Design a protein around this ligand. Structure first.
Ligand SMILES: CC(C)C[C@@H](NS(=O)(=O)Cc1ccccc1)C(=O)N1CCC[C@H]1C(=O)NCc1cc(Cl)ccc1CN
Ligand SMILES: *[C@@H]1O[C@H](CO)[C@@H](O)[C@H](O)[C@H]1NC(C)=O
Ligand code: NA
Ligand code: NA
Lengths: 251, 11, 28
């Protein structure tokens, strides 16, 4: 996260770290959506241009974390993966269209002060909240700059951007399965996701019921925090039918 | 840079 | 599930985090 701040303890209890077994290192962010299911970006697991194709046994999920590098004894919980499901129409060839994946845990994780699931949006909450100017929150342990790394989980609040402005900021083809967020050059403030924040959540706090909803998944950006560029996020509600199909079939 | 995690999670 | 999105150390105790107000203020 570029130009963010240290998270407060328990501020993002759905935050998940995807951890590589060997070598031991951060792979991506992710989020907890139930006691057995974790949501992430497809490109965290499958990205052929970079020779990335992880299998279940390659990875661990670490839940309840705050410190990036420490083993947080008595606080974090580490889970093995039963199965990975990647969207069948994930487009890694062009623009990361439908950049979404689910991971089922081998055993249910116990909830605690530090571990708790985020809500997924219904059509109505999505329609109400996914509006230009409305701010969401992005969290992760990714790099602090495009070109170092944080001691603890970072957080940044960013405004959703008008679709034509998103489109005009890039030569990449944008789809309805994405939205973009970030400050414009003339707005003074800044901030973005960066390398390592991939797969983490873009959340919004509903003013209707005071619950946090995951509206997006950290997906892609041309660099990190560049003037005139924006971060692009997987549109979670647009892909919710697939999410539900997977959970209903394999749950 | 990462602190070693308990072995049982690697088995 | 029914308890999703309510943080134990915040919503569940009626405590606010340091920047959530920034989000609320943007929901015009
Ligand atoms: C459509 C993609 C091929 C674009 C790619 N951009 S990139 O930074 O890695 C390479 C690049 C650098 C400068 C200018 C143009 C491209 C990218 O964002 N990728 C390629 C595969 C993984 C993903 C990524 O890094 N996602 C993390 C991320 C997510 C957000 Cl929301 C914002 C920034 C970043 C960091 N670039
Ligand atoms: C990725 O891994 C799976 C399983 O090893 C393999 O079958 C597949 O062809 C690989 N490449 C993909 C999905 O692009
Ligand atoms: Na364009
Ligand atoms: Na920018």
């Amino acid at each position: 996260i570029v130009e963010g701040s240290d998270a407060e303890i328990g501020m993002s209890p759905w935050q998940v770290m995807l951890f590589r077994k060997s070598p031991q290192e951060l792979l991506c962010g992710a989020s907890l959506i139930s006691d057995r299911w974790v949501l992430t970006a497809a490109h965290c697991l499958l990205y052929p241009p970079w020779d990335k194709n992880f299998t279940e046994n390659d990875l661990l999920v670490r839940i309840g974390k705050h410190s990036r590098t420490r083993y947080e004894r008595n606080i974090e919980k580490i889970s093995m993966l039963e199965k990975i499901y990647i969207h069948p129409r994930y487009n890694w060839r062009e623009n990361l269209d439908r950049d979404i994946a689910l991971m089922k845990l081998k055993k249910p994780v116990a909830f605690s002060d530090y571990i708790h699931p985020v809500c997924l949006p219904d059509r109505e909450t999505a329609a109400s909240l996914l509006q230009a100017g409305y701010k969401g929150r992005v969290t992760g342990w990714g790099n602090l700059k495009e070109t170092g790394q944080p001691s603890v989980l970072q957080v940044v609040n960013l405004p959703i951007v008008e679709r034509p402005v998103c489109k005009d900021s890039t030569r990449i083809r944008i789809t309805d399965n994405m939205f973009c967020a970030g400050y414009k050059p003339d707005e003074g403030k800044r901030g973005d996701a960066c390398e390592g924040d991939s797969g983490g959540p873009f959340v919004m706090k509903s003013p209707f019921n005071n619950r946090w909803y995951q509206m997006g998944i950290v997906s892609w950006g041309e660099g990190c925090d560049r003037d005139g560029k924006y971060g692009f996020y997987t549109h979670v509600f647009r892909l919710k039918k697939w999410i539900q199909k997977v959970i209903d079939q394999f749950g | 840079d990462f602190e070693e995690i308990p072995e049982e999670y690697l088995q | 599930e029914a308890d999703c999105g309510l943080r134990p150390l915040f919503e569940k105790k009626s405590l606010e985090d340091k920047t959530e107000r920034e989000l609320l203020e943007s929901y015009i």
